[PDB]
Amino acid sequence: EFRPEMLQGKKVIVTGASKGIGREMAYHLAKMGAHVVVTARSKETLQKVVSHCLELGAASAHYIAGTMEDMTFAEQFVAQAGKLMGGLDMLILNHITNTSLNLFHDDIHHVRKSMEVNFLSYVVLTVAALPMLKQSNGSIVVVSSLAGKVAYPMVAAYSASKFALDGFFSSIRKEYSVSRVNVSITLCVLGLIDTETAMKAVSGIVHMQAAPKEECALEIIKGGALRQEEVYYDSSLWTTLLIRNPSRKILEFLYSTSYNMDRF
Amino acid sequence: EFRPEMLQGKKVIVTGASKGIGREMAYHLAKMGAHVVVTARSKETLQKVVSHCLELGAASAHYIAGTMEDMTFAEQFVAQAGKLMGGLDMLILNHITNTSLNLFHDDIHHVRKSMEVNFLSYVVLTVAALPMLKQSNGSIVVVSSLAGKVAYPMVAAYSASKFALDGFFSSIRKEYSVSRVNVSITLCVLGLIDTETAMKAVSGIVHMQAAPKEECALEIIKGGALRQEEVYYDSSLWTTLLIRNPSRKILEFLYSTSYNMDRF
Ligand SMILES: NC(=O)c1ccc[n+]([C@@H]2O[C@H](COP(=O)([O-])OP(=O)(O)OC[C@H]3O[C@@H](n4cnc5c(N)ncnc54)[C@H](OP(=O)(O)O)[C@@H]3O)[C@@H](O)[C@H]2O)c1
Ligand SMILES: NC(=O)c1ccc[n+]([C@@H]2O[C@H](COP(=O)([O-])OP(=O)(O)OC[C@H]3O[C@@H](n4cnc5c(N)ncnc54)[C@H](OP(=O)(O)O)[C@@H]3O)[C@@H](O)[C@H]2O)c1
Ligand SMILES: COc1ccc(OC(C)(C)C(=O)N[C@@H]2[C@@H]3C[C@@H]4C[C@H]2C[C@@](C(N)=O)(C4)C3)cc1
Ligand SMILES: COc1ccc(OC(C)(C)C(=O)N[C@@H]2[C@@H]3C[C@@H]4C[C@H]2C[C@@](C(N)=O)(C4)C3)cc1
Numbered sequence A, B: 001e002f003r004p005e006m007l008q009g010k011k012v013i014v015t016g017a018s019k020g021i022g023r024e025m026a027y028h029l030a031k032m033g034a035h036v037v038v039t040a041r042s043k044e045t046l047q048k049v050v051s052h053c054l055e056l057g058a059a060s061a062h063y064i065a066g067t068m069e070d071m072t073f074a075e076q077f078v079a080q081a082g083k084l085m086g087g088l089d090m091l092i093l094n095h096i097t098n099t100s101l102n103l104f105h106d107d108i109h110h111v112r113k114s115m116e117v118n119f120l121s122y123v124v125l126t127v128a129a130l131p132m133l134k135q136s137n138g139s140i141v142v143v144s145s146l147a148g149k150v151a152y153p154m155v156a157a158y159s160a161s162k163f164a165l166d167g168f169f170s171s172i173r174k175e176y177s178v179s180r181v182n183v184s185i186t187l188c189v190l191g192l193i194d195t196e197t198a199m200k201a202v203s204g205i206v207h208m209q210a211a212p213k214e215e216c217a218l219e220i221i222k223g224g225a226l227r228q229e230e231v232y233y234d235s236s237l238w239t240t241l242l243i244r245n246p247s248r249k250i251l252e253f254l255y256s257t258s259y260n261m262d263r264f
Helices: A020-031 A043-056 A071-085 A108-136 A156-179 A196-202 A213-225 A246-254 B020-031 B043-056 B071-085 B108-136 B156-179 B196-202 B213-225 B246-254
Strands: A011-015 A035-040 A060-065 A090-093 A139-145 A184-190 A230-233 B011-015 B035-040 B060-065 B090-093 B139-145 B184-190 B230-233
Touching: A011 A020, A011 A071, A011 A108, A020 A035, A020 A043, A020 A196, A020 A213, A035 A043, A035 A071, A043 A060, A060 A071, A071 A108, A090 A108, A090 A213, A108 A139, A108 A156, A108 B108, A108 B156, A139 A156, A139 A213, A156 A184, A156 B108, A156 B156, A184 A213, A213 A230, B011 B020, B011 B071, B011 B108, B020 B035, B020 B043, B020 B196, B020 B213, B035 B043, B035 B071, B043 B060, B060 B071, B071 B108, B090 B108, B090 B213, B108 B139, B108 B156, B139 B156, B139 B213, B156 B184, B184 B213, B213 B230
Parallel strands: A011 A035, A011 A090, A035 A060, A090 A139, A139 A184, A184 A230, B011 B035, B011 B090, B035 B060, B090 B139, B139 B184, B184 B230
Antiparallel strands: none
């Protein structure tokens, strides 16, 4: 069972932590006395998150600013953050590119950028962070959505990227398992959360309950620290008891001996 | 219920039809006396597929050669094919970039190219083909894998792209449904198929039964023409009765009224 002590002194990276769910996570970690490196593009809002992080009692707090469109930056960032904290225990992958609810017409530029930022940079960051994470037997935490398990209209490019995350990360989990690479991977499936970006975007289009930004953030941190494979968090419990797919876990198992990894 | 007559005189595009499942589909279509435009990179193997297509009694048969890494080409191809057949009734999306079973290490180049070819060009091709497809109330057929519904080790990049397909195309289906855009979308989930590329790649690593290239090709064509949302095709029937996810269909529905499209 979870205890706040678990994060004490741990070295954690949070991406897209200038606002919303990201920022809330940085604050939780600050309260648990962890080492924290935060990132986003806006260095003003990032300075402010760092200050409050030190206030709340973080072991240390730093930021590095830059866009996750830039794959060179994503690689360099992880290294620099590692040197700042002298190692890495948890990689919380949270950022997403500016997106809004719209019918898809011919906006290929958006579909591309969505894969580039929401998915591809998550990979680039994982590659960079893995050596340090093997060292500490750490954790990767990937923030996904209900849109990354079931289909929604108006978030097509977004949904695609969030689906890709499940495919990739659920796949390398199986690789790590048999390679005895001892890094855990948590995929967090979130429903509507009352962040400002969210509430603006869904206003007048979608209607239903939003779950609170603060509790959601903790639920994520909880799941990663307890090395859970998935965290489900939504207002409706009917969702949390239907979003699960035991069929898939069974299939992935019946297939599990039908290949042979020993060769690697 | 299906009948070969349904394809008679229809104008159909098949991608990656120089070999394997692609080529088999082009032959089935030729037998049903359809118009056929095929594509891949290799113009030698493409000439050959065209000849045999004419032989089997295609209403017409042509090829256009070029790489689907090139997004300009994917756009131009659909247009040229449309002019050749004077319209378009079915878009069979089948090609994938060269891939093999391996643990993921740091091959970002591959992950990228995989999204570029296996997913992104599918979108580019859809955008281009949609005006003609609205005209004929046609069909889009998207070739996916069991790896695009459940997680496998050693095909991480591949799985990611095939997951993305489900997310994007399952999403725009819902858009088309309420926009009264009358183009059907078939996602074909395939298990191991005895194509050469497949048999070589899995040899010594994976073990189990492959389903025959020819029957698989027809099952796809069948599903698209009967405007089915999904086709499942695998050796094991235990798969076909476990791969289904009725929970998701239920959730997508309970959510279906909780947003309001009327604004678009
Ligand atoms: N909010 C919800 O109801 C909802 C629902 C389900 C799942 N989620 C998931 O939860 C996560 C966080 O959502 P949120 O609501 O907190 O979003 P948010 O408020 O918009 O925050 C996104 C963060 O990402 C950063 N960012 C945006 N573009 C970037 C770029 N190009 N490069 C680097 N950083 C960038 C932003 O900082 P800068 O713009 O200053 O760079 C910001 O700190 C997302 O992964 C989302 O998929 C959200
Ligand atoms: N085979 C299986 O057991 C298996 C299992 C599940 C799902 N599937 C799915 O079934 C579909 C077909 O599989 P397959 O076994 O027939 O594969 P395949 O034999 O390797 O054929 C792939 C086709 O794509 C073309 N292609 C490759 N790279 C290309 C590029 N960059 N640009 C344009 N065309 C390119 C190839 O022609 P050129 O190389 O000459 O360009 C070839 O015609 C794939 O989408 C795959 O995901 C296959
Ligand atoms: C069509 O009906 C629906 C659409 C969307 C719905 O919320 C989801 C659970 C899918 C979700 O994750 N939405 C996110 C997404 C889209 C938008 C709102 C939210 C924040 C977001 C952002 N932070 O940029 C902007 C990114 C529910 C229902
Ligand atoms: C780890 O155990 C497994 C791995 C892979 C398995 O087959 C799948 C059902 C996932 C699949 O779709 N494989 C495809 C894929 C990988 C390889 C073989 C096949 C053809 C392919 C190609 N045509 O390039 C080359 C593309 C089953 C089991």
